[PDB]
């Protein structure tokens, strides 16, 4: 319950679990990195509000509202695309954690 | 990395207070945070502690029942809540951090402290 990585041993005067308190201490740090760099990537947003347009002017209402659709597109795919890419990696980063404290 | 606690607070027995410490950095810490107290004219002790990721919470005997810690990760905060206030809480409070993820005997950095009088 106190770690990632550890061992169990079983010897005449009886058995029990332990942690690698060194390992875990690199893969935390690792993963504390990775979940900071994502959350720095990203700028928080600030005040934008809507326009009025009369019954002459639908060429630029039009354009306006193109501009917006495609920001949102691309920064909703960004996200996305990030996060499904991410989480691969990190379950590789573990299993990598593992085969090295057994070899 | 900097601990800053939140402002100084009078209160009457038997209500609750809860207080804050801010780390400076990165939102999420890589090591887990203790809460300690002193008297005047005594010396510290030890309340509990947070661990990050796994977020286990430990206490101490003497103050297991009357305190709460708790911690929100995104804007790196960790809060304290103490419950059942008497004239011997009258004390200074600081937050301190450990070199480790485990919570241990050795802490590194230490806060400026904020005074709770009853």
């Known amino acids: 319950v106190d770690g990632w990585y550890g061992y169990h041993h079983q010897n005449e005067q009886g058995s029990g679990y332990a942690a690698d308190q060194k390992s875990t201490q690199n893969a935390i740090n690792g993963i504390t990195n990775k979940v900071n760099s994502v959350i720095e990537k990203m700028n928080t947003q600030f005040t934008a509000v809507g326009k009025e347009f009369n019954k002459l002017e639908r060429r630029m209402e039009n354009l306006n509202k193109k501009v917006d659709d495609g920001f949102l597109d691309i920064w909703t795919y960004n996200a996305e695309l990030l996060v499904l890419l991410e989480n691969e990696r990190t379950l590789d980063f573990h299993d990598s954690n593992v085969k090295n404290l057994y070899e | 990395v900097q601990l800053v606690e939140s402002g100084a607070e009078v209160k009457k027995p038997g209500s609750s207070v809860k207080v804050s410490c801010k780390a400076s950095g990165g939102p999420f810490r890589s090591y887990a945070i203790s809460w300690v107290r002193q008297a005047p004219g005594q010396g510290p002790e030890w309340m509990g502690g947070?661990?990050?990721?796994?977020?286990?919470?430990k206490y101490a005997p003497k103050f297991q029942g009357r305190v709460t810690i708790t911690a929100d990760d995104f804007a790196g905060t960790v809060y304290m809540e103490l419950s059942s206030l008497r004239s011997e809480d009258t004390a200074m409070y600081y937050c301190?951090?450990?070199?480790?993820?485990?919570?241990?005997?050795?802490?590194?950095?230490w806060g400026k402290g904020t005074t709770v009088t009853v």
């Open positions: 947070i661990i990050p990721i796994f977020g286990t919470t």
């Open positions: 301190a951090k450990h070199m480790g993820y485990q919570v241990r005997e050795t802490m590194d950095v």
